[PDB]
Write a protein that binds this ligand. Structure first.
Ligand SMILES: *[C@@H]1O[C@H](CO)[C@@H](O[C@@H]2O[C@H](CO)[C@@H](O[C@@H]3O[C@H](CO[C@H]4O[C@H](CO)[C@@H](O)[C@H](O)[C@@H]4O)[C@@H](O)[C@H](O[C@H]4O[C@H](CO)[C@@H](O)[C@H](O)[C@@H]4O)[C@@H]3O)[C@H](O)[C@H]2NC(C)=O)[C@H](O)[C@H]1NC(C)=O
Ligand SMILES: *[C@@H]1O[C@H](CO)[C@@H](O[C@@H]2O[C@H](CO)[C@@H](O[C@@H]3O[C@H](CO[C@H]4O[C@H](CO)[C@@H](O)[C@H](O)[C@@H]4O)[C@@H](O)[C@H](O[C@H]4O[C@H](CO)[C@@H](O)[C@H](O)[C@@H]4O)[C@@H]3O)[C@H](O)[C@H]2NC(C)=O)[C@H](O)[C@H]1NC(C)=O
Ligand SMILES: *[C@@H]1O[C@H](CO)[C@@H](O[C@@H]2O[C@H](CO)[C@@H](O[C@@H]3O[C@H](CO[C@H]4O[C@H](CO)[C@@H](O)[C@H](O)[C@@H]4O)[C@@H](O)[C@H](O[C@H]4O[C@H](CO)[C@@H](O)[C@H](O)[C@@H]4O)[C@@H]3O)[C@H](O)[C@H]2NC(C)=O)[C@H](O)[C@H]1NC(C)=O
Ligand SMILES: *[C@@H]1O[C@H](CO)[C@@H](O[C@@H]2O[C@H](CO)[C@@H](O[C@@H]3O[C@H](CO[C@H]4O[C@H](CO)[C@@H](O)[C@H](O)[C@@H]4O)[C@@H](O)[C@H](O[C@H]4O[C@H](CO)[C@@H](O)[C@H](O)[C@@H]4O)[C@@H]3O)[C@H](O)[C@H]2NC(C)=O)[C@H](O)[C@H]1NC(C)=O
Ligand SMILES: *[C@@H]1O[C@H](CO)[C@@H](O[C@@H]2O[C@H](CO)[C@@H](O[C@@H]3O[C@H](CO[C@H]4O[C@H](CO)[C@@H](O)[C@H](O)[C@@H]4O)[C@@H](O)[C@H](O[C@H]4O[C@H](CO)[C@@H](O)[C@H](O)[C@@H]4O)[C@@H]3O)[C@H](O)[C@H]2NC(C)=O)[C@H](O)[C@H]1NC(C)=O
Ligand SMILES: *[C@@H]1O[C@H](CO[C@@H]2O[C@@H](C)[C@@H](O)[C@@H](O)[C@@H]2O)[C@@H](O[C@@H]2O[C@H](CO)[C@@H](O[C@@H]3O[C@H](CO)[C@@H](O)[C@H](O)[C@@H]3O)[C@H](O)[C@H]2NC(C)=O)[C@H](O)[C@H]1NC(C)=O
Ligand SMILES: *[C@@H]1O[C@H](CO[C@@H]2O[C@@H](C)[C@@H](O)[C@@H](O)[C@@H]2O)[C@@H](O[C@@H]2O[C@H](CO)[C@@H](O[C@@H]3O[C@H](CO)[C@@H](O)[C@H](O)[C@@H]3O)[C@H](O)[C@H]2NC(C)=O)[C@H](O)[C@H]1NC(C)=O
Ligand SMILES: *[C@@H]1O[C@H](CO)[C@@H](O[C@@H]2O[C@H](CO)[C@@H](O[C@@H]3O[C@H](CO)[C@@H](O)[C@H](O)[C@@H]3O)[C@H](O)[C@H]2NC(C)=O)[C@H](O)[C@H]1NC(C)=O
Ligand SMILES: *[C@@H]1O[C@H](CO)[C@@H](O[C@@H]2O[C@H](CO)[C@@H](O[C@@H]3O[C@H](CO)[C@@H](O)[C@H](O)[C@@H]3O)[C@H](O)[C@H]2NC(C)=O)[C@H](O)[C@H]1NC(C)=O
Ligand SMILES: *[C@@H]1O[C@H](CO[C@@H]2O[C@@H](C)[C@@H](O)[C@@H](O)[C@@H]2O)[C@@H](O[C@@H]2O[C@H](CO)[C@@H](O)[C@H](O)[C@H]2NC(C)=O)[C@H](O)[C@H]1NC(C)=O
Ligand code: NAG
Ligand code: NAG
Ligand code: NAG
Ligand code: NAG
Lengths: 248, 49, 198, 317, 198, 50, 99, 49
């Protein structure tokens, strides 16, 4: 709680938001193959840029087939009706209306077809906004990817939403020996209870440094163990150190 | 007559007639061997003319 | 005339291509056709020799960068570019035979640089996570930093409505009287449309 | 001086063309007022065209554009290049939305309307000489670069103020022009040696917008308003858009300011036309004839034209 | 239990101009009137291909430690076989470098479902233009204009990816002298789900 | 409440002013005495953009 | 599924042989035997039909791309969660039992 | 000759010929500027008649 971690994290966050905001503008100037990877700003911008024109399209061509003539003298029904006898004109306009209704049948078939996947995607999106934002998910890589989730920001985007997930990433590793457990008198096995915690010894007895500490498997917080964190077992193994009451 | 012909290098081999409901089903799927399963058949009506 | 592009008229079919001789033996037919209507293979009835024809044209791909044609990929060994490099499955043509370390256009494991060199894209190396262990040696992470990721999703689409009667007829009475015979399609389409919208 | 400036752009020897624009006139030829905008009969509309010839510091040359109306929706022009060397004079030219500063110098905020990145981002070679200068000119949609080979760019925007990063420059080193001028150019040498640059007297605007330069390949030269040209359409016309079609555009020879057709000039669709071509000529059979009509009354009063068909039929207008 | 899933599909490209006209000039001059459909279809095709190729190449994550530990020698089986799953090491082809080949089960399944010479393997298009042979089906649509793009990911890449993925569990500490026994990992998982005294 | 920096940037980047994203006033289509745009064309045709 | 994905390409060649109310399916055959006018009309019919067919084909293409997109999303999720770590949801990995 | 014409208010401007493979590609996409990428081209066959 010495507050240097807090300021380091805050300044790193400010620098990261600054450079991502810069990357929003002129991304292609210094974009690499890694910069255009999955869950990157370039991928999102190109996806939205293409999808906005994709959704804005598929309407202009609907007017086109009206000009098309279906084996008739002309595409204008008023032109045909007032120039030729009622019989063949009626037959030709029947052909015209049948073709036009078939075309709009195909169009409307495409419409609810489009509605289906947006239904499914909106279901997934509401799930994700319910679970990754308002609370904390325990599934690794589910929110954002390949890292634990801390929090997210939500921004309105044309025809949808944009998610800005902040992922904490490690940069250094600490390599220490581990100890399986303890046996006092080689009948009383003193063993740690919760698997998420682990007990280690910093270095060895080479210079009388047999100090024992307990910490989580992701955070490096060496702290003194507590009696309530251990349990007693009647069976012992070779791997457990055979200590005595004086050294307890 | 109507029959299933398989050609390999302009060579005629493996003749198979279709004057039988089993043969009709066999040459309805252009396969010498057919897997076990359910298939449709049409009632005979050529007996009486 | 053989081994040259020519306008040929064989057995009532006329085409354009290069004709060549093939070392195939067949005792049936006079010509052989594919499912494209092309009479590629025909036999010299007097001698029995067989000949095959291929078009005098081809389709090929090019890699355009900046304001000039830099990359040409094809299956022919002749090209405008000076350098012709054989690669597994095809030919590449360029004006530079140097190394390609910083490709601009990348696809699969193949990348092309601005200067025109081609190369194999090295495999991307991902992140690392430590497997669970109960004894021995553990690399506990520390000295964390930020990595902000982006995500975009859609939830809704723009709806559209239309009246079939006005679309198929511009206000005429006799036309709509004729249309009254067949109307269930209009009812179906509108019933779908407004229901989905609502 | 002016010879190099005219020789920057190539023109065929058998051609005469009148150029109109904010051409350099004097080192310190400037406005007598403080107005920078444009209105009715605009002359003092700021620096319409700027030219650079000399430096005092020598670190480099930088130019940028702005406007008093200060519309951040449009583009902005910024260029930088290094002097003291022809090879090192590769100018980096940018028509982009630069955030810059709302004021002059790092004292205020930036532009908050810059969503898209840029449009024009190029490197253009340049050369340094005593009589060679580097310039930029803007006029309505057109913008032209007087450096090496000519540039024409089409974009509707407004600009009224010019900024130079390098303050170490004398008054005569920079030259700003604000009033268009008309000059008749006549280069009968197929090269940099121009015969004369006498100013035009009458029919200057019409001559400028009607005279071409027949390229050796027959292509039409760039930089034409095409005021007296229309698309060939059988029915209807496209109000706005783009299309590709076969059209009568390739030219074999061009005749302007004519005198000889008053003697009953004869044309045949078979043989190449005879006359003083506007530069290069191509020996090809004509396909169609295009007429640029100045005055209808000339044709109405004494103009007599007869159409001779292949059959031999005569059609008198 | 068994499970099977798909992630990618084979892309295909085509030139409309060559498909609708076999090199004639007047026909393409007529076609120039209506071309926006060609632009639409090709824009969609190459855009879709490029985006999926980029994302699938970004999907893969590779570790060299798993590459080191994927060998049979580097694996210390203890009561478990892991032989038909783990690949066969020390292979020296004409290249002269050690490479990884298919193991038992997958090599069985490829030769079971995939017939040799099918479309799964990359197709050399040079033979189509080579000539003097009876053209197969592939050259037919090559002349037609249908281009079958090479697979975005090679099978060897998938196999080495699988080898890397399966080696994550045995990955103990960094620069481990010996791989941790699998029985220890099983004990670790059993303890993680619940405490045990046996 | 108005738009902040990033979103106001992205709208003006991807969406051109006067596009179909903004609501369209159909009164001008029936007002007349002007060269009808594309929207009025399908309005006359019968296509209603909700 | 392997034969399903390997199919849907052979039939694309088939409709080329189909004649759309024209004398013959070969454009070169028609152009050199009949006047330019009706030949142009017939080749216009041919190209319109062919472009419509390939429009249907390309519509089917991205339609196929959609579900493989969704399935690959699910697959990457499953490989991220059921393999590299241990899931606490009963029956999620494999089924009706702890993973 | 065949060329790309852009009209704005019945005004002819920005002419662009297509007597070049680069020009042919440019006017095959009715775009003055084309983004970097991969595009198909047809082998020349008009040299010999
Ligand atoms: C998580 O992040 C922290 C912060 O960076 C790391 O701590 C650093 O560790 C590295 C390497 O272990 C240190 O680098 C070297 O450390 C030597 C000994 O460290 C002591 O002295 C430094 C002051 O120099 C103290 O900051 C430190 O706490 C120790 O008390 C130094 O002698 C080295 O000095 C060299 O560099 C300096 C410039 O920094 C020169 O002036 C010297 O002349 C000499 O060339 C060097 O600094 C680093 O100092 C540590 N920093 C801090 C703040 O502790 C953790 O190691 C890391 N966790 C990991 C990797 O698991
Ligand atoms: C703290 O102290 C305890 C108590 O010593 C250590 O636990 C181990 O305890 C055993 C039993 O006292 C020690 O003896 C070893 O027994 C192992 C299993 O018992 C077998 O004994 C005989 C002989 O092997 C078998 O026939 C019988 O079926 C049992 O299965 C054996 O595996 C060991 O044998 C080793 O030595 C013999 C020679 O005596 C060799 O022939 C064998 O091949 C093998 O190498 C042994 O007999 C054992 O020594 C104790 N372990 C240790 C490491 O000393 C805890 O391990 C200790 N904790 C720490 C941290 O040191
Ligand atoms: C390959 O095919 C091309 C066209 O199909 C033919 O034409 C040119 O051939 C030259 C000869 O190698 C090549 O271009 C030359 O490259 C030289 C070295 O390149 C380096 O340096 C330049 C900058 O100078 C960098 O841009 C480049 O990336 C390299 O780092 C240059 O020195 C040459 O410049 C010289 O050009 C002329 C002619 O030599 C001189 O008079 C000039 O003064 C100047 O010094 C030149 O740029 C390249 O292959 C082709 N050029 C282009 C633009 O395509 C070749 O004949 C053919 N064969 C070979 C072997 O190239
Ligand atoms: C992750 O954790 C596991 C579990 O402990 C390690 O496995 C053992 O790790 C310990 C400590 O890391 C190892 O002990 C070390 O042995 C190394 C061997 O190098 C020397 O070995 C002999 C020993 O004298 C020398 O003769 C020889 O020339 C080598 O130079 C050394 O790092 C240490 O031994 C001695 O090395 C030098 C040179 O003698 C001395 O100056 C040192 O002071 C030191 O005394 C050290 O003792 C043990 O061998 C490992 N055993 C097994 C079975 O793995 C993993 O190694 C660890 N992963 C790592 C560290 O990457
Ligand atoms: C508006 O409406 C008018 C109708 O009034 C259209 O005018 C037609 O335009 C087309 C296109 O040019 C004309 O077709 C041309 O016919 C020429 C004459 O044909 C003779 O030569 C060919 C061999 O080329 C013989 O097969 C034939 O039997 C005749 O003997 C053709 O020669 C033209 O093709 C060739 O022209 C030149 C000749 O060298 C080549 O350079 C070309 O590349 C091309 O190969 C061409 O097909 C047609 O005659 C016109 N009709 C009339 C009545 O004038 C307009 O097209 C239409 N649209 C517009 C925008 O105006
Ligand atoms: C450049 O300007 C000069 C001057 O021409 C003047 O302006 C024109 C618009 C006309 O009105 C001319 O009548 C007027 O003089 C021209 O170049 C020179 O033109 C003269 C013509 O007077 C050429 O002399 C010719 O010489 C030949 C060979 O001896 C005689 O057969 C002719 O009868 C005539 O006398 C002279 O060679 C020519 N010199 C050069 C260097 O151009 C010209 O009009 C104009 N340039 C172009 C390309 O038009
Ligand atoms: C130019 O006009 C000539 C003659 O044709 C005339 O114009 C046509 C438009 C029609 O209206 C005709 O009724 C009318 O008579 C044609 O050129 C002639 O033919 C060739 C073409 O270059 C040339 O001479 C030829 O040379 C060959 C090889 O030696 C001989 O076999 C021929 O017999 C002929 O002599 C020459 O240009 C010209 N010759 C003659 C005798 O007139 C052509 O039709 C037309 N178009 C061109 C030339 O492009
Ligand atoms: C949050 O991020 C901004 C940058 O995105 C950090 O700097 C801020 O930058 C802007 C523009 O450069 C400053 O605006 C200022 O406007 C005045 C006129 O009112 C002008 O004279 C200045 O030259 C400048 O353009 C803004 O003041 C500045 N914010 C500051 C200095 O606090 C900002 O520092 C970041 N904030 C934090 C808490 O990290
Ligand atoms: C309609 O147009 C045709 C051409 O398309 C005219 O035919 C041409 O007429 C002129 C004079 O009428 C003829 O010139 C004559 O040539 C002879 C020598 O052959 C000469 O002795 C005469 O003094 C005169 O100059 C020319 O030959 C002739 N050309 C053709 C191909 O017939 C026709 O005259 C026009 N109609 C009328 C009513 O003028
Ligand atoms: C520079 O290039 C040579 C060969 O040119 C190409 O190199 C690659 C880009 C690839 O496209 C090859 O197919 C080309 O032939 C390189 O020599 C090759 O190196 C690769 C591995 O780097 C090896 O697999 C090949 O067998 C080598 N071929 C030959 C003929 O030696 C060379 O390594 C490149 N240099 C650098 C620094 O990358
Ligand atoms: C993040 O932004 C800072 C400035 O705020 C910059 O110095 C740093 O290089 C950026 N990081 C990356 C990875 O671009
Ligand atoms: C055919 O014969 C052999 C293969 O059978 C081959 O090498 C030879 O070149 C061919 N001859 C031809 C195609 O004329
Ligand atoms: C070119 O030379 C000039 C000399 O004044 C120098 O200022 C400039 O930086 C140089 N540019 C390059 C690209 O070398
Ligand atoms: C042209 O018209 C004029 C009318 O003034 C006439 O004098 C002259 O003779 C005509 N030319 C010819 C060749 O007929």
């Amino acid at each position: 709680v010495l507050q240097r971690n807090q300021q380091l994290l805050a300044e790193s966050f400010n620098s990261a938001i600054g450079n991502i905001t810069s990357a929003f503008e002129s991304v292609k100037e210094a974009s690499s193959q890694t910069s255009r990877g999955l869950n990157t700003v370039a991928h999102a911008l190109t996806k939205v840029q293409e999808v906005v024109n994709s959704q804005g399209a598929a309407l202009t061509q609907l007017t086109v087939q009206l000009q098309h003539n279906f084996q008739a003298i002309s595409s204008s029904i008023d032109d045909i009706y007032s120039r030729l006898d009622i019989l063949s004109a009626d037959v030709q306009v029947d052909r015209l209306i049948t073709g036009r209704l078939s075309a709009l049948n195909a169009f409307v078939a495409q419409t609810l077809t489009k509605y289906t996947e947006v239904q499914a995607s909106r279901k997934l999106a509401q799930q994700k906004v319910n679970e990754c934002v308002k609370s904390q998910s325990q599934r690794y890589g589910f929110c954002g990817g390949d890292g634990e989730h801390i929090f997210s920001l939500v921004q309105a985007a044309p025809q949808g939403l944009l998610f800005l997930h902040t992922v904490l990433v490690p940069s250094d590793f600490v390599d220490v020996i581990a100890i399986a457990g303890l046996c006092v008198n080689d009948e009383i096995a003193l063993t740690l209870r919760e698997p998420g915690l682990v007990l280690f010894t910093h270095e060895l007895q080479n210079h009388t440094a047999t100090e024992y500490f307990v910490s989580s498997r992701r955070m490096f917080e060496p702290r003194k163990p507590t009696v309530s964190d251990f349990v007693q077992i009647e069976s012992c193994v070779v791997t457990y150190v055979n200590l005595t009451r004086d050294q307890l | 007559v109507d029959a299933l012909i398989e050609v390999q290098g302009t060579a005629i081999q493996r003749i198979l007639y279709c004057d039988d409901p089993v043969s009709q089903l066999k040459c309805s799927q252009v396969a010498f061997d057919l897997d076990d399963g359910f298939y449709p058949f049409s009632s005979r009506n050529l007996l009486s003319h | 005339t053989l081994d040259v592009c020519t306008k040929y008229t064989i057995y009532g079919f006329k085409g354009e291509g290069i004709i060549t001789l093939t070392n195939s033996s067949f005792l049936a037919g006079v010509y052989y056709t594919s499912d494209s209507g092309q009479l590629l293979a025909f036999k010299n009835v007097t001698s029995g020799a067989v000949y095959s024809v291929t078009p005098c044209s081809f389709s090929e791909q090019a890699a355009y960068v900046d304001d000039d044609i830099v990359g040409v990929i094809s299956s022919l060994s002749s090209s405008t570019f000076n350098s012709t490099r054989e690669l597994p499955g095809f030919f590449y043509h360029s004006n530079d035979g140097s190394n390609c370390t910083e490709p601009v256009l990348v696809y699969s494991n193949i990348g092309v640089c601005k200067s025109g060199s081609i190369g194999y894209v090295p495999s991307q190396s991902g992140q690392v996570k430590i497997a669970p262990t109960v004894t021995g040696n553990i690399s506990i992470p520390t000295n964390f930093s930020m990595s902000i990721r982006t995500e975009y999703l859609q939830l809704y689409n723009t709806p559209v409505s239309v009246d079939c009667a006005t679309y198929v007829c511009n206000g005429n009475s006799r036309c709509k009287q004729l249309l009254t015979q067949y109307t269930a399609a209009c009812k179906t389409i509108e019933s779908a449309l407004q229901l989905s919208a609502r | 001086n002016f010879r190099r400036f005219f020789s920057k752009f190539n023109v065929q020897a058998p051609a005469v063309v009148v150029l109109g624009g904010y051409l350099p006139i004097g080192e310190n030829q400037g406005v007598n007022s403080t107005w920078y905008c444009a209105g009715q009969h605009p002359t003092a509309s700021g620096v319409h065209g700027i030219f650079v010839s000399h430096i005092r510091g020598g670190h480099g040359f930088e130019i940028g554009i702005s406007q008093e109306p200060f519309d951040p929706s449009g583009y902005q022009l910024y260029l930088h290049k290094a002097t003291n060397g022809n090879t090192n004079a590769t100018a980096r030219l940018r028509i982009c939305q630069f955030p810059s500063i709302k004021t002059l110098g790092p004292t205020a905020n930036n532009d908050v309307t810059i969503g898209r990145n840029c449009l024009f981002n190029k490197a253009i070679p340049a050369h340094m000489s005593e009589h060679s200068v580097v310039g930029i000119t803007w006029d309505n949609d057109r913008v032209t670069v007087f450096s090496d080979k000519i540039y024409y760019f089409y974009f509707k925007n407004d600009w009224s103020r010019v900024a130079t990063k390098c303050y170490n420059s004398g008054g005569c080193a920079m030259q700003y022009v604000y009033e268009p001028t008309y000059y008749m150019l006549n280069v009968t040498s197929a090269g940099e040696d121009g015969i004369s640059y006498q100013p035009c007297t009458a029919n200057c605007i019409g001559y400028a917008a009607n005279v071409f330069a027949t390229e050796p390949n027959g292509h039409i030269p760039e930089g034409f308003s095409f005021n007296n040209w229309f698309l060939l359409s059988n029915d209807s016309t496209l109000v706005h858009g783009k299309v590709v079609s076969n059209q009568p555009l390739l030219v074999n020879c061009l005749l302007a300011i004519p005198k000889i057709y008053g003697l009953g000039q004869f044309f045949s669709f078979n043989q190449t036309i005879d006359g003083v071509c506007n530069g290069a000529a191509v020996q090809r059979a004509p396909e169609a004839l295009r007429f640029n009509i100045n005055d209808t009354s000339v044709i109405l009063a004494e103009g007599s034209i007869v159409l001779h068909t292949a059959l031999g039929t005569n059609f008198s207008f | 239990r068994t499970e099977y899933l798909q992630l990618y599909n084979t892309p295909v490209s085509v030139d409309c101009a060559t498909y609708v006209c076999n090199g004639n000039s007047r026909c393409k001059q007529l076609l120039t009137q209506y071309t926006a459909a060609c632009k639409t279809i090709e824009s969609a095709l190459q855009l879709s291909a490029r985006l999926e190729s980029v994302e699938v190449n970004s999907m893969l994550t590779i570790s060299e430690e798993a590459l080191q530990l994927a060998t049979i020698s580097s694996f210390n089986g203890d009561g478990y076989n892991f032989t038909n799953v783990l690949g066969v090491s020390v292979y020296d082809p004409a290249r002269g470098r050690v490479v990884q080949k298919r193991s038992f089960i997958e090599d069985l399944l490829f030769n079971k479902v995939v017939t040799n010479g099918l479309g799964t393997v990359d197709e050399d298009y040079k033979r189509c233009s080579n000539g003097r042979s009876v053209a197969d089906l592939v050259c037919a649509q090559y002349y037609s204009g249908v281009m079958v793009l090479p697979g975005v990911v090679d099978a060897e890449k998938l196999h080495m990816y699988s080898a890397s993925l399966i080696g994550g569990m045995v990955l103990g500490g960094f620069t481990a002298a010996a791989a941790l026994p699998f029985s220890y990992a099983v004990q670790a998982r059993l303890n993680y789900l619940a405490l045990q005294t046996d």
